Amino acid sequence: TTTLAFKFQHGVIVAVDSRATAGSYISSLRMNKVIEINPYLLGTMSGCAADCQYWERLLAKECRLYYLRNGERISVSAASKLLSNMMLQYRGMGLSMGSMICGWDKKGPGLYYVDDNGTRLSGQMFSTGSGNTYAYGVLDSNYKWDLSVEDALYLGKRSILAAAHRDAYSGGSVNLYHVTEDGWIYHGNHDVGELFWKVKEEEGSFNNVIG
Amino acid sequence: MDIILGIRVQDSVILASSKAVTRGISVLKDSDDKTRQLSPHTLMSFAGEAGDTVQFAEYIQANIQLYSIREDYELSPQAVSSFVRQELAKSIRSRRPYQVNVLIGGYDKKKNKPELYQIDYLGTKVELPYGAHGYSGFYTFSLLDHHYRPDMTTEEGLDLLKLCVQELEKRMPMDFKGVIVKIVDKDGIRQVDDF
Amino acid sequence: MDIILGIRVQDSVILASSKAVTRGISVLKDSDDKTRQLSPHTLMSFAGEAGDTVQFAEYIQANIQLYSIREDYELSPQAVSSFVRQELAKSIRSRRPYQVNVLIGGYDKKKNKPELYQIDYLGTKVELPYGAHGYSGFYTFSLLDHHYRPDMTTEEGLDLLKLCVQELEKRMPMDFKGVIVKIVDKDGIRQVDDF
Amino acid sequence: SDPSSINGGIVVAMTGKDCVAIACDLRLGSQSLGVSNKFEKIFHYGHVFLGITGLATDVTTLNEMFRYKTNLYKLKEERAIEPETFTQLVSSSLYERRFGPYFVGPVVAGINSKSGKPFIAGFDLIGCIDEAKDFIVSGTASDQLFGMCESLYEPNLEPEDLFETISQALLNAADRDALSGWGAVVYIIKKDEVVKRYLKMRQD
Amino acid sequence: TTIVGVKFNNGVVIAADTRSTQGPIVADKNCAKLHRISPKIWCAGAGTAADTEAVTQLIGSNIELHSLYTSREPRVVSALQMLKQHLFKYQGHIGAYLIVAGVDPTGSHLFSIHAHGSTDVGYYLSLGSGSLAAMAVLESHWKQDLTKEEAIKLASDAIQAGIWNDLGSGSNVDVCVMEIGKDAEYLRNYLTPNVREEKQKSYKFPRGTTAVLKESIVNICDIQEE
Amino acid sequence: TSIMAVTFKDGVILGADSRTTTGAYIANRVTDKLTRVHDKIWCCRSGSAADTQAIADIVQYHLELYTSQYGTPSTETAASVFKELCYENKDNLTAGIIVAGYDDKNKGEVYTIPLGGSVHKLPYAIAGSGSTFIYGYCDKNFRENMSKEETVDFIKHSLSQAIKWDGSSGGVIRMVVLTAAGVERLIFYPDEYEQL
Amino acid sequence: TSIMAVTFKDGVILGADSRTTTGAYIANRVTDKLTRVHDKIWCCRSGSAADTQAIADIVQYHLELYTSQYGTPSTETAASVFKELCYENKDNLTAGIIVAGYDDKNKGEVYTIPLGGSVHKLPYAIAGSGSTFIYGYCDKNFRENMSKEETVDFIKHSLSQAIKWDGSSGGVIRMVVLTAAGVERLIFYPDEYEQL
Amino acid sequence: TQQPIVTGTSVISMKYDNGVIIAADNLGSYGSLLRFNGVERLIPVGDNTVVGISGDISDMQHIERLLKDLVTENAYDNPLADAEEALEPSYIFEYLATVMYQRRSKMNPLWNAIIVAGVQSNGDQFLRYVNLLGVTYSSPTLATGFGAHMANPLLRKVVDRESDIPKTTVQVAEEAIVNAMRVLYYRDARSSRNFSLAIIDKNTGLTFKKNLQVENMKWDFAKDIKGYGTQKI
Amino acid sequence: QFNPYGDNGGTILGIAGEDFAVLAGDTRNITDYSINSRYEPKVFDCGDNIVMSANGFAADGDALVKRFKNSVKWYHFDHNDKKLSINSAARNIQHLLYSRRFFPYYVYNIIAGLDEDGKGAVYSFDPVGSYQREQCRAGGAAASLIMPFLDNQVNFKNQYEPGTNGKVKKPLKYLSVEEVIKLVRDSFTSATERHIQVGDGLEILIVTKDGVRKEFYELKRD
Numbered sequence A: 001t002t003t004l005a006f007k008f009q010h011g012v013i014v015a016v017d018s019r020a021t022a023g024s025y026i027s028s029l030r031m032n033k034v035i036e037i038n039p040y041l042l043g044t045m046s047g048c049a050a051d052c053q054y055w056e057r058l059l060a061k062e063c064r065l066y067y068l069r070n071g072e073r074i075s076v077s078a079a080s081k082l083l084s085n086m087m088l089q090y091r092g093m094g095l096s097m098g099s100m101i102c103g104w105d106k107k108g109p110g111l112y113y114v115d116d117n118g119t120r121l122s123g124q125m126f127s128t129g130s131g132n133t134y135a136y137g138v139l140d141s142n143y144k145w146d147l148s149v150e151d152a153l154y155l156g157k158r159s160i161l162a163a164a165h166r167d168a169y170s171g172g173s174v175n176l177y178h179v180t181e182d183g184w185i186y187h188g189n190h191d192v193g194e195l196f197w198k199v200k201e202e203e204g205s206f207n208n209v210i211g
Numbered sequence B, C: 001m002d003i004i005l006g007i008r009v010q011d012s013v014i015l016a017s018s019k020a021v022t023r024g025i026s027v028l029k030d031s032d033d034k035t036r037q038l039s040p041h042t043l044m045s046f047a048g049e050a051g052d053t054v055q056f057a058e059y060i061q062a063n064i065q066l067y068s069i070r071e072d073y074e075l076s077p078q079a080v081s082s083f084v085r086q087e088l089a090k091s092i093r094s095r096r097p098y099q100v101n102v103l104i105g106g107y108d109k110k111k112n113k114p115e116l117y118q119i120d121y122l123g124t125k126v127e128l129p130y131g132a133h134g135y136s137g138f139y140t141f142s143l144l145d146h147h148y149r150p151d152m153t154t155e156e157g158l159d160l161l162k163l164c165v166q167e168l169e170k171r172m173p174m175d176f177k178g179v180i181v182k183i184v185d186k187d188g189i190r191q192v193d194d195f
Numbered sequence D: 001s002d003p004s005s006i007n008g009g010i011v012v013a014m015t016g017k018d019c020v021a022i023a024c025d026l027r028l029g030s031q032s033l034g035v036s037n038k039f040e041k042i043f044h045y046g047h048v049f050l051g052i053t054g055l056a057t058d059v060t061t062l063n064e065m066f067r068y069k070t071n072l073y074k075l076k077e078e079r080a081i082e083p084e085t086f087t088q089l090v091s092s093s094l095y096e097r098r099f100g101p102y103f104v105g106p107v108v109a110g111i112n113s114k115s116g117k118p119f120i121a122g123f124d125l126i127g128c129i130d131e132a133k134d135f136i137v138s139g140t141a142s143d144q145l146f147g148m149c150e151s152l153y154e155p156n157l158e159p160e161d162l163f164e165t166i167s168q169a170l171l172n173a174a175d176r177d178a179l180s181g182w183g184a185v186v187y188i189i190k191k192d193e194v195v196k197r198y199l200k201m202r203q204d
Numbered sequence E: 001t002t003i004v005g006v007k008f009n010n011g012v013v014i015a016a017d018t019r020s021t022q023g024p025i026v027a028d029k030n031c032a033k034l035h036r037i038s039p040k041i042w043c044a045g046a047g048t049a050a051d052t053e054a055v056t057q058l059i060g061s062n063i064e065l066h067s068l069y070t071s072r073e074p075r076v077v078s079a080l081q082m083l084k085q086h087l088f089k090y091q092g093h094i095g096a097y098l099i100v101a102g103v104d105p106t107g108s109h110l111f112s113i114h115a116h117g118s119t120d121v122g123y124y125l126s127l128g129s130g131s132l133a134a135m136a137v138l139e140s141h142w143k144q145d146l147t148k149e150e151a152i153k154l155a156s157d158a159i160q161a162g163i164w165n166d167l168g169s170g171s172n173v174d175v176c177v178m179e180i181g182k183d184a185e186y187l188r189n190y191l192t193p194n195v196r197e198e199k200q201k202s203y204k205f206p207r208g209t210t211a212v213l214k215e216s217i218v219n220i221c222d223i224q225e226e
Numbered sequence F, G: 001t002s003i004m005a006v007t008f009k010d011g012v013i014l015g016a017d018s019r020t021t022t023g024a025y026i027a028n029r030v031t032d033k034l035t036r037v038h039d040k041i042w043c044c045r046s047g048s049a050a051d052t053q054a055i056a057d058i059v060q061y062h063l064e065l066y067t068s069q070y071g072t073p074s075t076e077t078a079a080s081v082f083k084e085l086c087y088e089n090k091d092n093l094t095a096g097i098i099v100a101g102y103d104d105k106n107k108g109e110v111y112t113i114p115l116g117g118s119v120h121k122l123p124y125a126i127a128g129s130g131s132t133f134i135y136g137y138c139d140k141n142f143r144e145n146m147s148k149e150e151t152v153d154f155i156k157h158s159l160s161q162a163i164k165w166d167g168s169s170g171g172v173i174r175m176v177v178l179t180a181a182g183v184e185r186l187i188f189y190p191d192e193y194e195q196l
Numbered sequence H: 001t002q003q004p005i006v007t008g009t010s011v012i013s014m015k016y017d018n019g020v021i022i023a024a025d026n027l028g029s030y031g032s033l034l035r036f037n038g039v040e041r042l043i044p045v046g047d048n049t050v051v052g053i054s055g056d057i058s059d060m061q062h063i064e065r066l067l068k069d070l071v072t073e074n075a076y077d078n079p080l081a082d083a084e085e086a087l088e089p090s091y092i093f094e095y096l097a098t099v100m101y102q103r104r105s106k107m108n109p110l111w112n113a114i115i116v117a118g119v120q121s122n123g124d125q126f127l128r129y130v131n132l133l134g135v136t137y138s139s140p141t142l143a144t145g146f147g148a149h150m151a152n153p154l155l156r157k158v159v160d161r162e163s164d165i166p167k168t169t170v171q172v173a174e175e176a177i178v179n180a181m182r183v184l185y186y187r188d189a190r191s192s193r194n195f196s197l198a199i200i201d202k203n204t205g206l207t208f209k210k211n212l213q214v215e216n217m218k219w220d221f222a223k224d225i226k227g228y229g230t231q232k233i
Numbered sequence I: 001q002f003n004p005y006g007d008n009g010g011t012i013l014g015i016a017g018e019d020f021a022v023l024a025g026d027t028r029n030i031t032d033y034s035i036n037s038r039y040e041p042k043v044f045d046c047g048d049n050i051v052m053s054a055n056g057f058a059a060d061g062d063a064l065v066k067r068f069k070n071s072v073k074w075y076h077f078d079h080n081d082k083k084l085s086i087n088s089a090a091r092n093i094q095h096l097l098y099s100r101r102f103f104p105y106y107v108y109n110i111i112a113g114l115d116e117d118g119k120g121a122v123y124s125f126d127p128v129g130s131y132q133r134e135q136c137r138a139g140g141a142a143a144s145l146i147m148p149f150l151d152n153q154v155n156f157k158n159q160y161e162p163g164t165n166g167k168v169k170k171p172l173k174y175l176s177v178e179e180v181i182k183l184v185r186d187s188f189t190s191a192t193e194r195h196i197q198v199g200d201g202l203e204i205l206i207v208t209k210d211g212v213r214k215e216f217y218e219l220k221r222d
């Protein structure tokens, strides 16, 4: 997989691919790697699909219970920490999970990276999965805080495309999300096959590829 | 994580800790603060296996903060360092030991003295004028052995620390993305924002 | 050694290669030139196991220089790259293979075209507009895929190359001590002394 | 680690009515990394076509080797080599490296210039011949190709129909293999004309 | 694979299935496992498919040269001895397991040979993954003083047992009969009990279905005159 | 495998079972483990069939060439050739051979050549996986200068027990009698020896 | 080790050698491998000495407690207790035990309990490293309803051969006779049994 | 986790028109040593079920005791223990299958392969297999170990599919089983001549045959076989 | 050393129609190169208009199905005979699989039925519990043979409209139950030819609002 997420002036962008593999065999062409924990919280998935789905859906249970007890939405910081503590219980037991908890709370937009080791990091921009290096290349050179919602959505979309192209274990389609203070907003499923040719023509990029 | 340095001067303790966090072949973060304030005049930096470091540090932080509230009194750096050592010595014979190395920099308000303690994951404690963990000492201790005096000012301590980081940046194969420097003195803990 | 990059623009080929040489935990040198001129209009950069790299490069250099003298004629970059590939393909099934990866940048004076060849230690040859070895491509190919045009000037090629090195310097855990950049065009081979 | 799956790639060949077809993807990689989208795996020696999958250095090496041997054959015999004969030469050449083999999956395709009979054949890395009437597959998506060919194929197809069948077998097999794709080429071969078509496919 | 050899009154018969595999996948549905060493000496091989062919062609080549040198028809014991000495030299690294049978001026012969170089004599033999399924039939129905027609039946029944009950065996039955004072008759696809049924649908596509970028004529002809 | 060779008044007798196994599968139930290297010099083979066949073939070649030059070889000479092969190639072989032959001068002689390639001349010898179960029986029942009929019974009874307890042994009992009279092959089927 | 138990007309006899080895060193040349778990229920031990002693001690405890509550236990009952220990702790044990006892109702009985912890009732049983060499001899010479003197000779001759061929066996031959008359211990020294 | 010590080889079985047949030899092997020659590996449960077991004998004896205890337990507070609420083959099998799968899930398996053969209350034939892994399957013919490789092919020639069962008589089925046992004696090095055979018929009930021997064996042709290739004498 | 896992082969296939769904699987059961049974059912009616098949290690497959059938029974007891919807069954199965995260059920599971809007539904699982709803899915030994064929003949992948030359795709027209069964039969016939663990028989379970229907077809026995 390839996932990314970054904070900016108008909230946070979240973009993921949709490929699933079992060795060199592509098991799925379209798998959802985002979880809608609540209208203001998202979680990305990378690593063991089973581990990602189970523990993030368990996080949602625990985040939902927080709202009922306190009559108030959980913070992104607190949600990320609950998840990291779960990972710390099964320390060295072989879990494989890499996720970014993205949302908007009182402190503004929030983004935390969490993995199976228990690592929990706050940051402006993150990318996980086999194709994260390719995505970082596009992100680092084109990222600004002063980005427009339109340009930011494109950047995350274009960054996944770069990874889907080069990384054999990333591809299928792109799922886009935009988190605002009124909640997250889905910006569709985009087939890489069609998107690649479109970007190539409009942008002029991927000159080496013939089409 | 990798590099954590410590130096005890005349009236303060200075801790320098790298900013890099790596996962796979990618540097995920270049501004990570590898330290926790245990009490107003005691700072602990840490380095070791991923996840274990922060969990251990926060666990120690919680225990010292609990003690502070219970007694309405700040434990001496020496007392804190002994508590930390015991937890690590207890840990090493556990089913799954915590692989964390720490430096504890504190200013003892009773004795009016800065104090630096170096503790490794086995529970090996030593009080030192300057210390480090892992490979950091291999590059830096020769400079410290040469330049260090016990009557150094905080400014002179920072200059000698810059020289240690410059040597690390030259001779290490590892890019640790610079260091966050923090000073511990009679007035408490503060961060040097320009280094 | 580690990072070697290559890019073929309109009228030239640009090769960038890291300056670091490491032995144990110490960086012995930060100005190492990981390249050999095979002929006036053909340059080969290299990266791989210690010692094997220079021995192989110089062995290739000697063979091409011998050919040049014998025929009073410069072999085409394509011919040189094929010779190099065969030597590596021969090597991989030897008792002790040479663990060397190379980029061959040359300007073909007959066709008036720059040419870049990427060959790994197995003898896997590919002609490319831009190339790299090891982990270098993981960070840089996304930038090159985006920004590269075939009608780029040498200056634009250097600017895109700077952007690739900046990305490497940001996201690699490895300090490779910058790069030596060399340009191969119709007038021969020259080094960019300020980069 | 496995040499037969480092670089990736696929080849497929099919017989039709007085025609044959052979196709391949264009990808060359270093495991997960895609390196080239122009690495063609089909070569020809006169009117005999050879597709090779597997380790790219051995693919390149073997092409150069069979070019060498077929050029000498032609000088001595004063005629181009035929598919049946070339098949035996490939088998011989591979088995002579029995205990240090080329990590390849070759595929021969062509039409005998005398009898006019369409011919295809496949080999394992050490030379065992599979002379099939219907189709031959090779590569990292060989399982995928077997499934497509076995269901889509029917005998005695016309050139322009055979093209569609082999193209769809390749494309859809490649789209279920991470190590195959990045473009594709199809050769349509008749007794005295050969057409080569580059296909449009997803570049991920 | 499944292979068998059966002796009878005035000769010997061998038979084999026609399936070759790459693991659980079937590479060839109509493979030919009956190999010719000389006109009246045929062997059938199991194990590494290239090894069974190469070793058969090599010994067959040397047998032909020997036959020319001695002005005599080749003997099965010669092929046997040449094979086992070759296989023994390579210490089982040439994974050829063969049933060798034939007729010569001495009479009719039936031998088995393993990859390490051991040989055996028998009136009925079986090798390959389906050897146990085949041998069960042979032990059930074999008798002394078999006729030619009884032996072909027994041999093909033994192969069928392998085809139906062994996953490593399938498709068709090949046979070769070697009778004394006669030409050997090779019966390719003697039985064909595994024909694929008609498909429910035709998957022939409309012309223009596949997207194309470039077209070009390939020059296969040599350089032209004028 | 169960093999033995026994000297007696008029000469020597070799005996063996007929089972060859590949694990638990019986690849051949009618094996002939009694092999002739010369007119009246035979051997019993145990261990790797490939190795023992290759050796016995080479030995047969050496003794055929010996005979052409120097006349009929001794049983001791045959055992020496076996030994020289088994000893010098001990790292690459797994062969346990019993040599048995008849001269008019030396009469019946038996030599055993175990794994390492040592040689041991004996009145009688036993070998193979099934031999372990009859060390006690054979030691108690063996006599020197037995008659032919007594010796056949001794081998029959002995191999009967070896077959009974050893799964790697079985089938028919083959025997080869070596005397001045000539060479007599014998065979004994399960229905005969099982009821002993 | 060479151990055996044999039923006969008047009861049952246990027999064993007296050698205990640590590799090739004989740690004890006068071992008593015939152990009593009840008045007229004895066992022969093979395998790990630590394991077999620990087991037999526990069994002796169970049968002593059985007797206090329910009266004299059967030989079958004793074998069942042995089995239950050998079977349930088979992963952590290396014990091959032969059980033998006399009742007035059931007379002489013999049970053998090999490594896995299975039970097998037999007319006679043999076990230990040396047993392998006398399977053939014992099968040929064993009869049912032998006299005491015939049975003593059978065991003596049998273990004589086991000792002769097995290096792990040797020393003296101990025997224990179990009849209505009582319990008789016997011993036979090398100078007696070696010349058989 | 263990390793099998004393073992029993093939168990073979098949369905016929009115019931089922099952057979297994009387040998208890100790590696290559043919140690025990009087071992019964077919164990009847009531008058409607026979359980045939191969593999580790110590584990067989344990299962034999579980079944004996199962009959005892079923009779408790059960007036219809010898009638409507008697043990069925399907009950006995599912119990064993449950035990086998549980033991493999604790990484401490019963090292056996089991075939439960019987006739149900409604006259339906029951024949199902289970092993140390807890794997279960049913077929017109079933066999364990070597029987799977050599017996099934012969038995499947009589009953190739479900529709062949009503066409197969008890004389034909028994003849096929007895022939299979002969073939196994020829070719299985861990087998014996002596065996037991059980027939469970819906009309004539349970017939248990002991001390059967393999007969009509072909060995005469061995006299003619000489050498391993070139030897004539 | 004891290996608690085994491979019983087999192959399964689920296709979701507009108002129906099918779950098919071969009836062959094997170990190594031997056939255990030519007819051993693998696809089961689990109640509530849901069909299920756990392909791979048969012992784990039988145990999982047995537990889910039990889960359906207890869902009725605990929630007033409410019908277990296909989406709810899928989530329940995830938790059954993950309960053995550290000693997994070695099976590829597929269920099929109708969603709450009456439309066809197929859910696919990995051995440790990741699941997703799909239109088409082949699982087991010959999964890699069949899936590409279904991408082509069900979702019309790489198929365009003649004359346009790659500009306009083939429109995604829905498939009837008769058309789907043809694709299923051809898929298994093709898999039988090239895969040694597939053959003997094919059993298809079809699910509509009217209930669950069965269809059986012979396959090659070699």
Ligand SMILES: *[C@@](C)(CO)[C@](*)(O)[C@H](Cc1ccccc1)NC(=O)[C@H](Cc1c[nH]c2ccccc12)NC(=O)[C@@H](C)NC(=O)CN1CCOCC1
Binding pocket: A001, A002, A019, A020, A021, A022, A023, A027, A028, A031, A032, A033, A045, A046, A047, A048, A049, A050, A052, A096, A129, A130, A169, A170, I124, I125, I126, I130, I131, I132
């Ligand atoms: C890249 C594709 C890495 O290969 C992604 O990280 C991707 C992440 C992901 C997360 C949620 C849903 C889907 C995908 N990971 C995988 O696809 C993952 C890679 C993989 C395989 N074995 C692994 C072991 C350890 C770490 C990663 C591993 N694949 C899977 O987890 C496989 C086993 N799961 C599936 O293919 C899920 N199937 C469910 C039923 O439908 C077909 C797919």
Ligand SMILES: *[C@@](C)(CO)[C@](*)(O)[C@H](Cc1ccccc1)NC(=O)[C@H](Cc1c[nH]c2ccccc12)NC(=O)[C@@H](C)NC(=O)CN1CCOCC1
Binding pocket: D124, D125, D128, E001, E002, E019, E020, E021, E022, E023, E027, E031, E032, E033, E045, E046, E047, E048, E049, E050, E052, E095, E128, E129, E168, E169
């Ligand atoms: C049965 C089908 C057993 O599988 C037959 O014995 C069959 C014999 C045969 C003879 C002539 C033509 C065709 C078939 N054997 C095979 O088909 C055989 C299976 C095989 C593969 N590797 C083996 C090693 C040892 C024993 C059997 C082996 N096929 C082949 O050998 C062909 C397909 N070659 C390969 O698969 C090459 N492999 C070599 C090592 O690297 C992987 C590929």
Ligand SMILES: [Mg+2]
Binding pocket: A163, A164, A165, A166, A167, A168, A169, A170, A171, D203, D204
């Ligand atoms: Mg990709």
Ligand SMILES: [Mg+2]
Binding pocket: B118, B119, B120, B124, B125, B126
């Ligand atoms: Mg320390």
Ligand SMILES: [Mg+2]
Binding pocket: G163, G164, G165, G166, G167, G168, G169, G170
């Ligand atoms: Mg002794």
Ligand SMILES: [Mg+2]
Binding pocket: E162, E163, E164, E165, E166, E167, E168, E169, E170, I221, I222
């Ligand atoms: Mg078959």
